[PDB]
From a paper:
HIV-1 employs its trimeric env glycoprotein, composed of the receptor binding domain gp120 and the membrane anchored fusion protein subunit gp41 to enter host cells.
We assembled the extracellular domain of gp41 from two fragments containing residues 528 (lacking 16 N-terminal gp41 residues including FP) to 581 (FPPR-heptad repeat 1, HR1) and residues 629 to 683 (HR2-MPER) (gp41528–683). Gp41528–683 was crystallized in space group P63. The structure was solved by molecular replacement and refined to a resolution of 2 Å. The crystal structure composed of residues 531–581 and 629–681 plus 5 N-terminal Flag-tag residues reveals the six helical bundle core with FPPR and MPER extending in a helical conformation resulting in an 88 Å-long rod-like structure. Instead the FPPR region splays the inner core apart starting from Leu 545 (a position). The FPPR-MPER region is only stabilized by few hydrophobic contacts between adjacent chains, including interactions of Gly 531- Leu679, Ala 533- Trp 670, Met 535-Ile 675/Asn 671, Thr 536/Leu 537 - Trp 666 and one hydrogen bond between the carbonyl of Ala 533 and NE1 of Trp 670.
Residue numbers in the entry:
A (entry chain C): 624 to 681
B (entry chain N): 531 to 581
Write the structure that this text describes.
């Protein structure tokens, strides 16, 4: 009971560091995904203009 | 080579970003679950001392 408190603190701080890392990785992957997506809104809209433009069959 | 290559290539890149990002969130939830059981355990020891 003197060395169990510690193990709890050990594991407490390890999973806490792990969650922090994981949210960090997610915050950066979310930045990345919103860029990738912003850039797709554009490519689509772009080509979606030459198409409608030249003539619109079907 | 009609730039539909270019067009789906990014969308391929996106569902790839989205799929990893779900693994990220899943792993976060799992680590949170662990953190949660430590706090439960912790709380059950404080109960099983108040007798």
């Amino acid at each position: 009971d003197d060395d169990d408190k510690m193990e709890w603190d050990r594991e407490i701080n390890n999973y806490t560091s792990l969650i922090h890392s994981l949210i960090e990785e997610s915050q950066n992957q979310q930045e990345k995904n919103e860029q990738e997506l912003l850039e797709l809104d554009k490519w689509a809209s772009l080509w979606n203009w030459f198409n409608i433009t030249n003539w619109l069959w079907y | 080579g009609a730039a539909s290559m270019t067009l789906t290539v990014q969308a391929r890149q996106l569902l790839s970003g989205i799929v990893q990002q779900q693994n990220n969130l899943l792993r976060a939830i799992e680590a949170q679950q662990h953190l949660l059981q430590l706090t439960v355990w912790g709380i059950k020891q404080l109960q099983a001392r108040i007798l």
